Protein backbone atom coordinates (compact mmCIF):
# COMPACT_ATOMS: atom_id res chain seq x y z
CA UNK A 1 0.00 0.00 0.00
CA UNK A 2 0.49 3.61 -0.46
CA UNK A 3 -0.03 7.04 -0.61
CA UNK A 4 -1.79 6.36 -4.51
CA UNK A 5 -3.56 3.23 -3.43
CA UNK A 6 -5.23 4.89 -0.04
CA UNK A 7 -5.90 8.07 -2.04
CA UNK A 8 -7.73 6.29 -4.64
CA UNK A 9 -9.19 3.91 -2.63
CA UNK A 10 -10.61 6.74 -0.57
CA UNK A 11 -11.82 9.31 -2.93
CA UNK A 12 -12.76 6.89 -6.16
CA UNK A 13 -12.34 7.42 -9.93
CA UNK A 14 -15.07 9.22 -12.37
CA UNK A 15 -14.69 10.17 -15.35
CA UNK A 16 -17.30 12.83 -15.66
CA UNK A 17 -18.36 15.87 -13.48
CA UNK A 18 -19.65 15.29 -10.09
CA UNK A 19 -20.68 16.69 -7.18
CA UNK A 20 -18.22 15.82 -4.20
CA UNK A 21 -19.82 15.66 -0.59
CA UNK A 22 -19.81 19.26 0.04
CA UNK A 23 -21.51 19.48 -3.38
CA UNK A 24 -18.69 20.81 -5.45
CA UNK A 25 -17.77 20.51 -9.36
CA UNK A 26 -15.45 17.41 -9.03
CA UNK A 27 -13.92 14.96 -11.70
CA UNK A 28 -10.89 12.79 -11.70
CA UNK A 29 -9.33 10.97 -8.53
CA UNK A 30 -11.05 13.79 -6.10
CA UNK A 31 -9.58 16.68 -8.32
CA UNK A 32 -11.74 19.64 -7.59
CA UNK A 33 -12.32 22.33 -10.05
CA UNK A 34 -14.33 24.43 -8.27
CA UNK A 35 -16.54 25.97 -5.64
CA UNK A 36 -18.29 27.47 -8.29
CA UNK A 37 -22.09 26.11 -8.60
CA UNK A 38 -22.30 27.17 -12.08
CA UNK A 39 -21.40 24.01 -14.31
CA UNK A 40 -20.13 26.03 -17.34
CA UNK A 41 -17.70 27.35 -15.21
CA UNK A 42 -16.78 23.71 -14.02
CA UNK A 43 -16.72 22.50 -18.14
CA UNK A 44 -14.39 25.75 -18.14
CA UNK A 45 -12.01 25.03 -15.52
CA UNK A 46 -11.73 21.32 -16.58
CA UNK A 47 -11.02 22.37 -19.86
CA UNK A 48 -8.15 24.76 -19.16
CA UNK A 49 -6.31 21.76 -16.98
CA UNK A 50 -6.68 18.91 -19.39
CA UNK A 51 -5.82 21.39 -22.36
CA UNK A 52 -8.15 20.37 -24.31
CA UNK A 53 -12.57 20.77 -25.25
CA UNK A 54 -13.60 18.22 -22.85
CA UNK A 55 -17.08 18.56 -22.91
CA UNK A 56 -17.29 17.84 -19.28
CA UNK A 57 -15.60 14.17 -19.89
CA UNK A 58 -11.97 12.35 -19.59
CA UNK A 59 -9.35 9.52 -20.27
CA UNK A 60 -8.74 6.88 -17.51
CA UNK A 61 -4.90 8.65 -18.64
CA UNK A 62 -6.07 11.75 -17.94
CA UNK A 63 -7.36 11.38 -14.70
CA UNK A 64 -4.19 9.90 -13.64
CA UNK A 65 -2.23 12.83 -14.68
CA UNK A 66 -4.32 15.51 -12.38
CA UNK A 67 -4.22 12.84 -9.75
CA UNK A 68 -0.30 12.57 -9.99
CA UNK A 69 -0.23 16.79 -9.79
CA UNK A 70 -2.44 17.02 -7.31
CA UNK A 71 -0.78 14.53 -4.78
CA UNK A 72 2.83 16.11 -5.75
CA UNK A 73 0.95 19.83 -4.58
CA UNK A 74 -0.14 18.46 -1.74
CA UNK A 75 3.24 17.38 -0.76
CA UNK A 76 4.82 20.16 -1.46
CA UNK A 77 2.30 22.19 0.03
CA UNK A 78 2.95 20.33 3.59
CA UNK A 79 6.72 20.97 3.10
CA UNK A 80 6.51 24.71 2.13
CA UNK A 81 4.49 25.18 5.21
CA UNK A 82 6.15 26.05 8.57
CA UNK A 83 3.58 24.85 10.81
CA UNK A 84 2.90 21.57 9.17
CA UNK A 85 6.46 20.52 8.00
CA UNK A 86 7.82 19.53 10.95
CA UNK A 87 5.44 17.53 11.91
CA UNK A 88 5.56 15.77 8.61
CA UNK A 89 9.08 15.35 9.18
CA UNK A 90 8.18 13.59 12.74
CA UNK A 91 6.77 10.71 11.57
CA UNK A 92 6.94 7.46 9.91
CA UNK A 93 5.97 6.60 6.45
CA UNK A 94 2.49 5.23 6.91
CA UNK A 95 1.69 8.33 9.33
CA UNK A 96 2.89 10.49 6.75
CA UNK A 97 0.06 9.66 4.13
CA UNK A 98 -2.20 9.62 6.39
CA UNK A 99 -0.86 13.67 6.47
CA UNK A 100 -0.88 13.94 2.89
CA UNK A 101 -4.43 12.52 2.69
CA UNK A 102 -5.74 15.16 5.07
CA UNK A 103 -4.41 18.10 2.65
CA UNK A 104 -5.17 16.34 0.03
CA UNK A 105 -8.62 16.36 0.79
CA UNK A 106 -9.30 19.71 2.68
CA UNK A 107 -6.00 21.76 1.66
CA UNK A 108 -3.97 23.70 3.65
CA UNK A 109 -6.51 25.89 5.06
CA UNK A 110 -8.37 22.78 6.44
CA UNK A 111 -5.15 21.00 7.84
CA UNK A 112 -4.37 24.28 9.37
CA UNK A 113 -7.36 24.08 12.23
CA UNK A 114 -6.18 20.92 13.64
CA UNK A 115 -3.28 23.18 15.26
CA UNK A 116 -4.23 20.70 18.18
CA UNK A 117 -4.03 17.41 16.96
CA UNK A 118 -1.07 18.32 14.63
CA UNK A 119 1.38 18.97 18.52
CA UNK A 120 -0.20 15.65 19.52
CA UNK A 121 1.00 13.71 16.62
CA UNK A 122 4.34 15.64 17.05
CA UNK A 123 4.52 14.34 20.75
CA UNK A 124 3.68 10.96 19.39
CA UNK A 125 0.59 11.01 21.63
CA UNK A 126 -1.42 8.60 19.55
CA UNK A 127 -4.93 7.89 21.49
CA UNK A 128 -4.56 11.32 22.17
CA UNK A 129 -4.48 12.55 18.96
CA UNK A 130 -7.12 9.90 17.34
CA UNK A 131 -9.82 11.40 20.17
CA UNK A 132 -8.99 14.86 19.54
CA UNK A 133 -9.30 14.57 15.33
CA UNK A 134 -12.12 12.82 16.14
CA UNK A 135 -13.92 16.22 17.39
CA UNK A 136 -14.19 17.73 13.90
CA UNK A 137 -16.89 18.84 11.15
CA UNK A 138 -14.29 16.62 9.78
CA UNK A 139 -15.27 13.84 11.34
CA UNK A 140 -18.90 14.53 11.40
CA UNK A 141 -18.91 15.15 7.85
CA UNK A 142 -17.13 12.24 6.66
CA UNK A 143 -16.84 9.63 9.15
CA UNK A 144 -15.78 6.66 7.18
CA UNK A 145 -12.92 7.88 5.27
CA UNK A 146 -12.49 10.39 8.75
CA UNK A 147 -12.11 6.56 10.91
CA UNK A 148 -9.76 5.18 8.11
CA UNK A 149 -7.33 8.08 7.87
CA UNK A 150 -7.46 8.81 12.13
CA UNK A 151 -6.94 4.18 12.48
CA UNK A 152 -3.80 5.30 10.55
CA UNK A 153 -2.48 7.69 12.49
CA UNK A 154 -3.33 5.82 15.62
CA UNK A 155 -1.44 2.73 14.79
CA UNK A 156 1.16 3.42 11.69
CA UNK A 157 -0.36 0.57 10.00
CA UNK A 158 -2.55 0.23 6.64
CA UNK A 159 -5.15 -2.08 8.15
CA UNK A 160 -7.90 0.22 7.49
CA UNK A 161 -7.45 0.27 4.26
CA UNK A 162 -6.80 -3.96 4.18
CL1 LIG B 1 -4.65 21.91 -12.72
CL1 LIG C 1 -16.96 8.99 4.56
Request: charge should be positive.
Amino acid sequence: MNIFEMLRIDEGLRLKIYKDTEGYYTIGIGHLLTKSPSLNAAKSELDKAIGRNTNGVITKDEAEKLFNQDVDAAVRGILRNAKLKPVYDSLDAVRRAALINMMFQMGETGVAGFTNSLRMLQQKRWDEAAVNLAKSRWYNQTPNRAKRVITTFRTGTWDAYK
